[PDB]
């Protein structure tokens, strides 16, 4: 089994590590401090036998809606980036990541909503976002380096 707790400095270098594995999108480690930083209340990672195998970066945004019709202002959380290491993928890690960070951006950070980008062949992580009820927004087209389309996916 595995735990959560709130992402911290030391734990900068795995969750890079586990980033480069697995996503093609490889911050540099600043990004990564700045949103630690800034928003780690929502910023998790998930423990197995005390090292970390996966994690959610989170940001708090103020702006425009993505899921009202007239353009309207709102508080919104963004979720940057989530993975799991391969060997621990399908225990719930992800979604019990996710739950903790959303819980945290609407009861920390005043989050309103919720949106997030994917691209349009990850179907895991489609599957995984909308059991959390997000759905489809819109297609980003070309959203990705090389030309991959990406969903914008948003939860009320
Ligand atoms: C997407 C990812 C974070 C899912 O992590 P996870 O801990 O394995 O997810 P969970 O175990 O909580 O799964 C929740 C739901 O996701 C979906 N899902 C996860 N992996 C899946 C897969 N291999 N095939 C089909 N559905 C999958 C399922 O609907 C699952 O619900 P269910 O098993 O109850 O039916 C993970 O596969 C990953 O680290 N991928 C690489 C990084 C990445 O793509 N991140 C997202 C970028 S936007
Ligand atoms: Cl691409």
Redesign the pocket.
């Known amino acids: 089994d595995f735990t959560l707790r709130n992402a911290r400095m030391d734990d900068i270098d795995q969750i890079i590590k ?1 980033n480069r594995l ?2 093609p999108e490889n911050y540099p480690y600043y990004f990564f401090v700045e949103h630690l930083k800034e928003y780690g209340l929502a910023f998790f990672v ?1 423990i197995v036998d005390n090292s970390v195998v ?1 994690y959610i970066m989170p940001r708090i945004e103020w702006g425009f809606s993505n899921i009202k019709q007239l353009p309207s202002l709102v508080r919104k959380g963004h ?1 940057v ?6 060997e ?11 739950e903790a960070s959303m819980k945290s951006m609407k009861n920390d950070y005043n989050a309103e909503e919720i949106y ?4 349009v062949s ?4 489609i ?2 976002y ?2 959390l009820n997000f759905k489809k927004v819109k297609v980003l087209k070309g959203y990705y380096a090389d030309g991959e389309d990406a969903y914008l996916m948003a939860r009320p």
């Open positions: 586990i697995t996503l998930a996966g979720v980036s989530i993975a799991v290491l391969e621990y993928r399908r225990k719930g890690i992800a979604t019990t990541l996710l997030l980008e994917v691209r990850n179907y895991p992580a599957a995984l909308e059991k």
